[PDB]
Write a protein that binds this ligand. Sequence first.
Ligand SMILES: O=[N+]([O-])c1ccc(O)cc1
Lengths: 117, 113
Amino acid sequence: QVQLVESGPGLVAPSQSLSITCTVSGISLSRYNVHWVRQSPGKGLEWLGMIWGGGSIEYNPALKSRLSISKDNSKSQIFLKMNSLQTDDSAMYYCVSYGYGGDRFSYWGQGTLVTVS
Amino acid sequence: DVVMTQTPSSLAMSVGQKVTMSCKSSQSLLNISNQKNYLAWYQQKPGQSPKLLVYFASTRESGVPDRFIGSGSGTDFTLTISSVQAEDQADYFCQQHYRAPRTFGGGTKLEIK
Ligand SMILES: O=[N+]([O-])c1ccc(O)cc1
C-alpha cells in the first residue's frame, strides 16, 4: 500500500546537473522524514541529505555545496538536485522514509539509476 | 564523521547455526535524553533495496522474524540470527542515525552454505 518511487534522468553527461523526484503514496509527508541515499558497488552506501516532517533539511556536509533538497507536501513528492556532475557520481539513488503509525516504521524506495558518462 | 565499522566483512555459516555480526562506531550513539541508541540494521538481497530489520538498536521492524535480534548500546552493537535459515544469505548493513551525515557500515556479506 505505501510506495516510494523515484524518477531520474538515466544517463547524463558530466558537469551537467542532476535532478531526481521521490514520489510518495500511502502516507503523509508531514509525519515522515525522507532521506536521500545512493549506493554503488565501489563507493558503498552514502547518506546525502534528509528533510524532516516539519520541513527542516540536512545535508551531507561533504556534499552540501552541490546538493539541494526540498519537498511538496500537497503532491507528496521530495526532490534532490545535484550540480557539477562527475563520472564519480554514478549510483543507484534512493529515497527512504521513517515515521510512526504505518504498517512499518520505514519504507525504502525502488531506486533510480544514475549513469554519469 | 562518525565512523561505522562492520565485522566481519564476510563469513560463511551453515543453516540452523547462530550468527553474530558486529557493528561499532567511533562515538557513542546513545542519546542522553531519551536513552535511545540511534542505530539501524538492514538486509539486502541481490538487485533489491535494503530493508530495515531493526531500529533503535533493538526494536524489530514490523514483519521481521524473531530470529533477528539486535543488541548493544553506546558504540558496540550486534545483530544475531538465533538459527539462520537459507534465505538469510544477504548483505547486512548498520547505519548510525545519531548525527548527520548518517553514515553506514561497510557491510557484512553472509554466505549460507
Ligand atoms: O535508531 N534508528 O535506527 C533510527 C532512529 C530514528 C530514525 O528516524 C530512524 C532510525
